[PDB]
């Protein structure tokens, strides 16, 4: 059915205790405990009678005026006619404040509303009745309110507060007798710092749980119109903090809705950070960070290096995101999920620069004819992929990996893969690059289509023709063309269509 | 009503619960969120840590409360040791899964239970609006690791069809026996046959030793060739031969224990219809029961089922004493 | 068919999430709000998309059905003005602790046992930092703080009475009164 705070849901008996003394409480006295409603405890009854009733009074009912008349009369008796103009809600708040302050712990039937043991039991059961969200809210309340007081108050002050809570006459007398205990109490002038500390904590919490929904709505509606960088710039927040808030909001929504969180979101918001920082760590081994990816010459050493770097930075994104131009190769949601989920590491380590794809298309070759006929067609099938890569004098140069793996190269390195069914196919980009020395860097800024052209950049035909390529001078080009073009004309020995009448 | 992955939970990290969770984690290619419940959170932490280190393809979440397990999991599978724990987890606890079940949840208990318990669990699930299946698992934990288990599912046919892709991750032979409780009945029949064949194999090897056959492999070969082949005989031939040769040896322990077999057969007897004052006269079944009880009355209840060979005559002497008491 | 595949077999479907859940609210809001292409017709004056100014942001949120509580730039909390919390975070640790918690995790709190990394030592170090800040306040490098609830409760009865009857917010205002 419906379970809430008013009607406590039935919980399991084997639940662990929340407070420390109940963990050491003996089992017999644990079994002695009854199963009672929350208000059956004297502290719960006191709360329901004093504070919860006044909280309910603000709701629309019939006895509201009847009780408000009495409370207003009491307030007028307290403060002459000044409090007549005070609002009814203000009067209720004042009464609640006074009843909270005048609360005392002592003998149950001697005037005190409830005992310290009853208060401890109520606190323990109230903590037990909380779920994960309840405990999270409890910790939030602790951080908002109690933590500044603890940070600003001395252990002597805490012990004095404990003595006040227990309200033991002899123990209070013993604590007050000590001269050092009298002199070690804190000063209100120093305790005033707790106000500013609490304000700062509440300011951070307000940032989180009030600017999270707004930033989340803006970034979910129009991520390209409101990127995290723009949101941080316009709201004065930290650029990293905005993304952290978005991630936290989405993950908390998933967790409190009992849905598996979108694990791709931290990758999509910290793509650069994910590649840079997230690593697998061994036990007992201390690790370091590479300040620079390689040993290179700085761009300040030469005037041309400086110009090259500034031009590349101009052509480069400051912060690349999921919707930007380099990620336009993820047409459908299948591509989107595949790229951003469980394979982003390999997908980003495949190629350093960001290109309009992740690899190269795979095309399959044709099998050489086998004159043995069907007596040998089976022999090229096996249980494994047989991968072959060309080596030789002209192949295997690490410094020429890009030019050797360029598909538009007539002397491209030749790779073949025989599948377990005999199919001869080409190799993927990662498969081709696996044969060279590994490159373990990435580029998240430079995007080639944004390069400058026209101003200061104009490739000229004169520079290329300075080599003077002449077909009558060198005929290797004609030889390669002859090699490429078909040769079936040689068996016909002007080409003309057949004549049939 | 959003698009997400199935929340699949496993309750009970006993001996058979760990292989099921490991199989789900290994063979779930990020198609499910794996919730793992444990009475002590340390066991759930250990299981999830071992799965993560070995390499799991699905995210996991640990639980120690049935309320959280119910609020999270879309499908729940319980692999417990005895019937009392299953009954407490399903009906008796304040956060009992079946009593607090949500309209649409599917709860499958692989623990062997009694017919009355299965009937009441199915009735409560139907009243709550959820779906319940009783699928008593058959096989050792090594067989569950190999995925070659045996499941006899009784309940909703549509629910069985929907749950088939999850069963196949740790069981290859899954049989939809029929309505609710048919899996429990089939498990009872299988356990009775197992006990009877174990007693028969023990007696056969005892008489083999008496006659003088001094090799067990050469006997099991001809037995398998002939019509006297039996799975229990094939499994227990060497251990029974060794125990007969040396009575001083104490039979080892195993996952299939004498106490558990006796409990299952007691559930079968309780669910067995009566013909009035007298019970059903099954001679072989009664002899197996008496021999197993005599074996368990020697502190050997937690050992292997092969211990019955040392207490065949103990059960016979006990029966003779009980029959001579009124004579 | 939601629970029927191509072959016709019945397939498992996740149970419906709670309709009152914030995740369901976000899903419905995304599905029912106006598309991102109709928020602004004309773009910004200088090559940039609209929505960076607070007026445009408020207009967009209104079109999406959300009333922005931070109407003005100054209404943003602006956590870069904090003088005490950053020092604590820099030296000791996360004073908040449960500010970033997913589900019972990522908690920045001292250990239960105690010792050198316990609540007592943590509070002692935090109080030492607050004492340093109060020393700065006394030396005049920082403004005198206002009157707090704890400070008022600590003060003598006469001080509390006159503070309540004067409405003073600062010890300076109390001195003037």
């Amino acid at each position: 059915p419906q379970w809430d705070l008013w009607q406590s849901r039935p919980r399991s008996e084997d639940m662990d205790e929340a407070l420390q003394p109940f963990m050491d409480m003996p089992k017999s006295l644990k079994d002695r405990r009854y199963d009672i409603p929350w208000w059956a405890n004297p502290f719960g009854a006191w709360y329901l009678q004093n504070i919860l009733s006044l909280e309910l009074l603000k709701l629309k009912s019939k006895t509201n005026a009847e009780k408000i008349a009495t409370y207003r009369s009491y307030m007028r008796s307290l403060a002459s006619g000044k409090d007549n103009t005070m609002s009814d809600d203000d009067v209720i708040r004042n009464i609640i404040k006074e009843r909270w302050k005048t609360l005392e712990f002592g003998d149950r039937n001697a005037g005190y509303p409830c005992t310290f043991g009853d208060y401890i039991q109520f606190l323990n059961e109230w903590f037990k009745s909380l779920d994960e969200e309840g405990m999270q809210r409890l910790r939030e309340h602790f951080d908002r309110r109690i933590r500044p007081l603890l940070a600003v108050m001395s252990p002597v002050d805490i012990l004095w507060l404990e003595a006040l809570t227990q309200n033991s006459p002899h123990n209070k007398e013993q604590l007050q007798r000590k001269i050092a205990f009298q002199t070690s109490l804190g000063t209100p002038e120093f305790f005033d710092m707790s106000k500013r500390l609490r304000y700062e904590i509440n300011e951070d919490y307000k940032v989180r749980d009030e600017l999270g929904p707004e930033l989340f709505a803006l970034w979910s509606k129009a991520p390209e119109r409101w990127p995290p960088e723009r949101l941080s710039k316009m709201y004065g927040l930290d650029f990293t903090l905005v993304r952290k808030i978005l991630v936290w909001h989405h993950f908390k929504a998933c967790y409190d809705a009992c849905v598996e969180p979108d694990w791709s979101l931290p990758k999509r918001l910290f793509a650069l950070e994910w590649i840079r920082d997230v690593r697998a760590r061994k036990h007992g081994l201390f690790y370091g960070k590479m300040r620079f990816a390689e040993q290179k010459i700085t761009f300040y050493s030469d005037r041309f290096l400086f110009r090259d770097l500034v031009n590349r930075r101009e052509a480069s994104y400051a912060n690349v995101w999921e919707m930007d131009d380099p990620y336009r190769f993820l047409q459908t949601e299948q591509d989107y999920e595949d790229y951003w989920g469980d394979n982003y590491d390999v997908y980003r380590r495949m190629f350093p620069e960001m290109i309009g794809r992740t690899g190269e298309p795979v095309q399959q070759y044709g099998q050489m004819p086998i004159w043995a006929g069907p007596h040998r067609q089976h022999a090229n099938k096996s249980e494994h992929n047989w991968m072959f890569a060309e080596i030789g004098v002209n192949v295997g140069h690490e410094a020429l990996k890009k030019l050797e793996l360029d598909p538009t190269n007539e002397k491209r390195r030749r790779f073949v893969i025989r599948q377990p069914d005999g199919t001869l196919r080409s190799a993927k980009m990662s498969e081709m690059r696996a044969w060279y020395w590994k490159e373990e860097w990435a580029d998240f800024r430079f995007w080639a289509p944004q390069m400058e052209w026209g101003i200061e950049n104009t490739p000229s035909q004169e520079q290329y023709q300075e080599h003077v390529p002449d077909t009558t001078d060198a005929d290797f080009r004609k030889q390669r063309r002859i090699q490429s073009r078909p040769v079936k004309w040689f068996y016909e020995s002007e080409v003309r269509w057949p004549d049939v009448i | 009503a959003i698009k997400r992955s199935l929340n699949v939970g496993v309750v009970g990290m006993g001996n058979m619960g760990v292989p099921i969770a490991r199989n789900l984690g290994f063979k779930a290619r990020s198609a499910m969120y794996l919730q793992i419940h444990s009475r002590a959170l340390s066991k759930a932490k250990r299981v999830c840590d071992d799965l993560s280190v070995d390499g799991a393809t699905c995210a996991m979440r640990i639980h120690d409360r049935y309320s959280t397990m119910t609020k999270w999991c879309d499908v729940i599978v319980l692999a417990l040791a005895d019937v009392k724990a299953s009954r407490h987890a399903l009906l008796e606890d304040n956060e009992s899964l079946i009593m607090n079940a949500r309209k649409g949840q599917i709860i499958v208990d692989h623990t062997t239970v009694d017919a009355e318990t299965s009937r009441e669990c199915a009735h409560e699930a139907a009243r709550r609006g959820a779906y319940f299946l009783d699928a008593p698992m058959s096989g050792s934990p090594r067989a569950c690791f190999n995925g070659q288990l045996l499941l006899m599912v009784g309940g909703d046919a549509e629910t069985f069809q929907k749950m088939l892709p999850i069963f196949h991750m740790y069981a290859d032979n899954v049989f939809h026996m029929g309505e609710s409780g048919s899996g429990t009945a089939a498990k009872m029949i299988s356990q009775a046959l197992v006990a009877s064949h174990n007693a028969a194999a023990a007696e056969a090897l005892s008489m083999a030793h008496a006659l003088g056959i001094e090799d067990q492999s050469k006997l099991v070969q001809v037995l398998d060739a002939s019509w006297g082949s039996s799975t229990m005989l094939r499994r227990n031939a060497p251990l029974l031969q060794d125990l007969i040769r040396n009575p001083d040896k104490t039979p080892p322990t195993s996952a299939v224990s004498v106490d558990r077999l006796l409990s299952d057969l007691a559930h079968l007897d309780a669910s067995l219809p009566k013909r009035g004052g007298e019970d059903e006269p099954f001679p072989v079944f009664d002899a197996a029961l008496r021999s197993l009880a005599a074996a368990s009355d020697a502190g050997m209840g937690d050992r292997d089922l092969a211990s019955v060979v040392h207490y065949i005559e103990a059960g016979e002497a006990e029966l003779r004493n009980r029959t001579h008491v009124p004579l | 068919r939601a629970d029927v595949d191509a072959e016709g077999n019945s397939i498992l479907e996740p149970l419906a999430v709670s309709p009152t859940s914030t995740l369901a609210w976000w899903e419905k809001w995304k599905r029912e709000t106006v598309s991102k292409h109709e928020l602004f017709t004309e773009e910004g004056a200088d090559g940039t998309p609209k929505g960076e100014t607070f007026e445009e942001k408020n207009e967009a949120l209104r079109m999406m059905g959300i009333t922005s509580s931070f109407q003005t730039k100054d209404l943003v909390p602006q956590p870069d003005r904090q003088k005490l919390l950053p020092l604590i975070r820099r030296e000791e640790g996360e004073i908040a602790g449960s500010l970033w918690a997913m589900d019972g995790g990522e908690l920045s709190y001292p250990k239960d046992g105690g010792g050198p990394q316990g609540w007592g030592v943590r509070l002692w170090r935090e109080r030492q930092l607050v004492k340093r800040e109060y020393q700065k306040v006394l030396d005049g490098y920082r403004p005198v703080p206002q009157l707090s609830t704890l400070g008022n409760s600590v003060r003598t009865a006469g001080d509390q009475l006159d503070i309540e009857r004067s409405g003073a917010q600062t010890p300076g205002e109390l001195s003037d009164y």
Partner: peptide
């Protein structure tokens, strides 16, 4: 290995904070 349950955080609520904070438990 053992998870920190932070049960010492709950012990601070057993100190009658209403005496000094003047009813901080409620909404404020």
């Amino acid at each position: 290995n053992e998870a920190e349950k932070h049960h010492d955080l709950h012990m601070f609520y057993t100190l009658a904070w209403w005496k000094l904070g003047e009813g901080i438990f409620g909404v404020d």
